[PDB]
Subunit: 376 residues, 5 copies
């Protein structure tokens, strides 16, 4: 009864186009915030952020005010889309094909006129993904909200603190905070300024997944390449093993390309690590070819260079604690012994290069210590 | 004739925004329940569940009532979307881009006023998929339903037991049940509490499919890797079998990556088993290098360390029941080759024992393993 | 002049909510059928069927009746969606995200009130795909249609024979028929019964494409695997060829997995055949290591067990028609070992050849529709 | 001042359902045509064609007529969807999920009543893609247009010659023409005839892209397969090279599988080329194993059959212009056996070179459109 | 108060179909422009350009004029889609499935009637992507805008300079400018001419990403292929190394195929470079077979043709500074291996030079190479 009567009275002469102020000259205060429920996906290749968001827009309709003593029990009303004035707060940097992914729901008003509007939505935002440090990367993705067609003299946008009470963790991202800021900006279209609210979603990538799936396997497959320097040359599989492992590491670079965006702002840390390891494996291929040339040397070819006969069979040989047809066998054994010395020297040197480059590149990430401590 | 008169009478002064109650102060009892017709696809990369649900919302419209003695033969009327007050019971954890996968259908009513509204839809829900024990894992997926803008004082939501009579099996998931629960929660937006009905769809993965596409194949490829220890070394193909088989085993991890989500909450059992297999095969390659180093040992090189000369050619050799300058060099080479043969067999047995243990000990660490294997096969 | 008058006259007091009967108590007969124009795709992985369908729903509106003598030349009228009552017959087992893929068009009524409504649509239906017999599979995909909110006491649904005259073939699927059936089922929501019309689209997969792109290439590549027993061991490439072929046959399994659903209701025939082929090639590599192990046996090692010396160098040798001094003796003992290694190649050449022939033939002819397949599409 | 009055005047008693004819009995002449702007993609796997089309429907509304002397300066008016009667001309064989991809725009009327309506749209049409001759194929894709609910007695559809002046080239397809035809067919639903206008888009695939991406690389990888007969046997990599190149060729059959539809109407030409190439390389591996069997032949076994000793070491050896004591005698027999490996290598090198040449030319020039193709695209 | 009065007054007799001019005979000037905020995606395979655009359409409504002295504080009004006449300026060369990706927003009018309309949108346009010079390529994508149904005699379209102040860089594309041009074209449909405004978005591709993912790795993998000529033949892995690296170079051609459109207008520079690389590696395999044929020459076979005995063992050998029956047989076999080694060394220089030329020569055959190398590295 009273609900029917009140609904009939509240729509007499009501125009959903009129801004609901008592004094037309004064701006209308709109309190804006959001509740972030989940970060569903961050597809870095297209530079878009998908979030489950409950935007919270509250304002006051001067006309939707009733005296509850005259409408007993009726303390709130609800109006669907198109029947009540609403703030046209859009996401400026939207990436959704429709550009406005908000789902239009009811506006709950009470007896005093305070309007509460809590549209749910899946919002896609064009976020610049700083991939410099991936997988140890921290992203600051902005969600910029503002009235599309109302300036400061008409819609006085005000900020309320973001809600994360109902947030459900993701698995891949540690929300470090959603600090917000209210700005008063001027635009090259118009003279009246337009205020905006920008929420900076700060998220730290949890590195266990990519860590176990890319870094640890890469390290140990690069380690399978370093076994070539312990394999004997007579096996006739040095080049096979070495080249096969190198061409196997290409799969990791392919996967990164499937994940990463095609941006030239910087070179990804994962990319530098894959590049450094794979170039070192290629150098292992070059050096084993040299070992095989020393090993398979025609005895009646060139003589042993004195430089080599001392730099390998005297110094390096001692450092590592190694130590007519039959004269040629001695000669070839000497050439084969030189091949053995090169194997051990480069084994040690390439082992250290692997150790340094791996540790040196990974600790250049600011977030490395935080990462290893929180995620392992 | 009477249908026209009824439809004309029932819309007079009707407002689709007025809760259809007689006493405004009392909440309106709405009964809610769903019907899971099919689980078409549970997405595990985007942590999204997909279902073919037919919701059920029954209430009582105080305004849409008539005396059948006046309107012969019109015992029921139907109203489309936007003409009758309808409960705004949305899914809270929706993953659909429109957020509302409900298809708006008619609202049947009878001569007493009891509305009945069953909307169909392909509901997508953001469900946390516990992948810790995958493929032997019970996902527990919540579908939380509630009126978006009505609190407890206005819409008294009540739960009815879920219907699964028409449920159509899936093939991949054995529905273990869909228990529901009614909650009264408070929100940081508002003071009036809001009740919600949450249906937890509990799903058991049928493991035969993965069983034969990934795990048993991986076991057999790992045995194929294990064959390197039976190859004679003179073939010159030990390392090519080892490394080639390892590279073939990498596709299984690629597949599991293509299915799994990029989550750090846990390490899937499939991942731990695949990783242990990869580590065992890589260690087989390292040991392959060691055996080839012993086999190709220069006769005029280092001497056999007594620790080796006993630990390999005396104890391990007996346990397994094995037993001129060029001739002496061949004799040393012949010894070293015996050491190469002994290492192959010891590591054959040892890697055989680690394969059976690791596989059984990782797979039988899943609580649902027995239920699964006993029923899925 | 008269079409305008008729259109104005027919909407006087008309309500698109009223079911158009003269006697409210009697149900309204609705004749339901469809014209199947094309089966666009059957994505078996998702268990969905995409079809081009022109549902044919005809009924009688009591109120849309005029006397053509008073409206000369105006013999039919047309009304768009939302202006006249039309039966809300949906596809119950729909798999489309919107759940209702029907495209709403006009309703052609004539002077006697008979309404004809033939909406086109791209329909996705959740069809259980029996993948046991793939590629030689026959599917029975159900399209279940019924009025959502009208029971038998209100809308007397009647079936008309399915139309396939204008059906345009697909390329992969042989429509075996679209037999229909009217059923009266009870539901756990309600007491009034609900009738439905179920069209079972029966489809035979045309086997030439997959059979050329999966089955035959596996046969020939697996035959290449069994050929290792003609390669000599001294080549030093038996293991390379054998393992390379086995690892190459895995890509077919990747494609088969990319196509098929993730179901445990039964094991597909394509998979049992590939698995049986794959294990035979794997066993061939197992035999390969044994051949190279008997060959590369230390001449001064263990002696040939008499049991081996007979099973290989005496009996099997006849059936298949085969037939410094320390170094010479060492070559001699090694020489019998090489021949023993050679006999295993030939025995296992014959034996594994038979396994593939039996395995392949015995698994393929266990499909009921196999003879139809080879006879119709080859 | 006058545009407001005209718009106010023209909507008095106007009903957008009424066909705008003066005599209801006479059909309404509608002139239909289209402007083809671009062929964005034809995804043959799903058998659908994506085109940018601006359909051109022009007719005469009897009611939207004004005298320009009374409304000076107001010479044309525009009406959006739902306010003016429009022809419901749909694409019968549509493959779009919505089934109607036309974008609804204004209807430009002038003072004489002639309505001009040019809705743009991206149209998906279910087109039969003849993949028999691919990549040297020509397609005939139908765009079938007709009034959905108006027959010949009410809407007399008429064809106008299609416009391609503004056509934007594609890159992959040479528009050979869009000849149209008006047909009047009877349907199994209804008695009143229905006219339709069918545009057969004739498209020739430009073969430079696939000819360099698939044909030439396959030729060259098959040439590396033929190189096995020039490798010495002692290298121990003949089988490695041959099998490696075969598994390299497998990706091309994967690529066509990703491109081509899974239809069994025929075997695509590219598939027939790849199949013949793979068979030739596999047979080359077979012969490679036979040569290795001859090369690694023990000299204590069987003696060389006379047939072999002539067919290889006498005739074929002459035509192609090649030409401790126990160890030497065995080396002589081993040397004789190794010579046989060289003869087979050389004979089969020439023979497998020729069958690649024949197979290549005989399959490529079996397409009628091949010569025109190579002449236009290379 | 005054806002509601003004809204009531402005909608009396207003028709959103009427073009809002005082004199019907004179065309209505509409100023058109756009603000390009981002180039979201260039999927060249579909020949489509995805951009974030805020089209700017400004005109004057003759009827939406009020005196602010009579409506104090009410200086602007806003009207949603369907309530006021708007210019139907569409993107002619649209590739979006709905064909109109504009998001309909309010039209901000002031007291003098000037209407300001700035709709946002994700715009897909069918743009011819000249892949001739890829990755060092510059694209000129046209966005053609015009009123669909209003010709020059009714809607006098005028262009305003494009806004890029708020443009946010992309990462892969350097916006070189968006020059516009206003045209008056005649169409085969109609007699009244129709003006359009065409914005040519000019984009220079950033080459660091592709430079480091495909060009440099291809060079280094082809160099790895060139190592075959330093490998000794007795290793028995020349053919293995060469052929394996060639199948590895095929992934790059597959990647380019995944990227590039299916166009025959020209051959992309990347494709020509990869093709030359593949020909060099394949010719290296062919000559590798020849050297192995030289090395595995039966000593009792043919004799060395004098041509060979000079061109390899005298000139080329000196240029590169190289220098009983079984004894004779090994001696002749020793020369064949020496001939085999000489061919390897010549091929090392020659194929190195071919590698040097093709790589350097083909890459600077792109006009934009210097611009790229200077800006992108
Ligand atoms: C209508 O709702 C508004 C907002 O929820 C109420 O205003 C709040 O009242 C509480 C009670 O003292 C204050 O603590 C808040 O600061 C107020 N907020 C605002 C924005 O005004 C208002 O009281 C409600 N009206 C009635 C009649 O209860
Ligand atoms: C209106 O259309 C209906 C259906 O097309 C017509 O009913 C059919 O008429 C034919 C002609 O004799 C009969 O053979 C069929 O059996 C009728 N069908 C049914 C279901 O009764 C009807 O005659 C048409 N009315 C007019 C005035 O032409
Ligand atoms: C309504 O807005 C228009 C444009 O925003 C105003 O016209 C501009 O006025 C300024 C100041 O005189 C000039 O510099 C511009 O050149 C004008 N632009 C155009 C397109 O004419 C107009 O003055 C505003 N109306 C009122 C009442 O202030
Ligand atoms: C391509 O090659 C690989 C790819 C991989 O995934 C993307 C992984 N992944 C992996 O090792 N994941 C693990 C290990 C453990 C323990 O837990 N997760 C490995 C290889 Cl080799
Ligand atoms: C890549 O390598 C494999 C991949 C596989 O799928 C993902 C399978 N799958 C498999 O064998 N599936 C079967 C077997 C039987 C019987 O039924 N289904 C095997 C390998 Cl080796
Ligand atoms: C992975 O390896 C293959 C894959 C293939 O496709 C998926 C095919 N396909 C094929 O042979 N298709 C043919 C042959 C003829 C004649 O016609 N179509 C072959 C191989 Cl080897
Ligand atoms: Cl009603 C009508 C009349 C004309 C047009 C056309 C004229 C120009 C070119 C395409 C479009 N704009 C489109 N619609
Ligand atoms: Ca991500």
């Amino acid at each position: 009864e009273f609900q029917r009567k009140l609904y009939k009275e509240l729509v007499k002469n009501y125009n959903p186009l009129e801004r609901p102020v008592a004094n037309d000259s004064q701006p209308l205060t709109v309190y804006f915030s959001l509740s972030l429920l989940q970060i569903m996906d961050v597809d870095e290749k297209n530079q878009v952020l998908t979030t489950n968001i409950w935007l919270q827009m509250s304002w006051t309709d001067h006309y939707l005010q009733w005296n509850v003593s005259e409408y007993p029990g009726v303390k709130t009303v609800r109006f669907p889309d198109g029947q009540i004035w609403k703030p046209d707060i859009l996401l400026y940097n939207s990436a959704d094909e429709r550009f406005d992914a908000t789902f239009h729901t009811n506006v709950l008003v009470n007896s005093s006129g305070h309007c509460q509007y809590l549209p749910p939505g899946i919002f896609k935002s064009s976020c610049y993904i700083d991939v410099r440090w991936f997988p140890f990367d921290v992203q600051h993705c902005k969600l910029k909200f503002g009235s599309w067609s109302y300036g400061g003299w008409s819609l006085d946008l005000q900020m309320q603190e973001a809600d994360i009470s109902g947030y459900i963790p993701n698995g891949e991202w540690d929300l470090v905070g959603i600090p917000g800021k209210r700005s008063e900006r001027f635009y090259e279209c118009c003279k009246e300024p337009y205020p905006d609210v920008t929420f900076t979603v700060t998220m730290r990538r949890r590195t266990l997944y990519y860590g176990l799936n890319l870094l640890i396997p890469c390290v140990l497959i690069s380690a399978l390449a370093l076994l070539v320097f312990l394999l004997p040359a007579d096996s006739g599989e040095k080049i096979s093993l070495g080249i096969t492992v190198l061409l196997s590491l290409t799969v990791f670079m392919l996967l990164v390309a499937e994940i990463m965006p095609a941006t030239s702002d910087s070179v990804p840390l994962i990319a530098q690590y894959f590049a450094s390891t794979m170039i070192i494996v290629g150098l292992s291929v070059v050096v084993t070819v040299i070992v095989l040339q020393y090993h398979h040397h025609d005895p009646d070819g060139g003589k042993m260079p004195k430089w080599t006969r001392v730099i390998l069979l005297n110094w390096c040989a001692w450092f590592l604690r190694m130590k007519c047809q039959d004269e040629s066998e001695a000669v070839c054994s000497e050439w084969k012994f030189a091949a053995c010395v090169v194997d051990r020297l480069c084994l040690m040197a390439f082992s250290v290069f692997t150790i340094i480059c791996t540790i040196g590149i990974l600790m250049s990430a600011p977030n490395f210590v935080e990462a290893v401590s929180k995620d392992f």
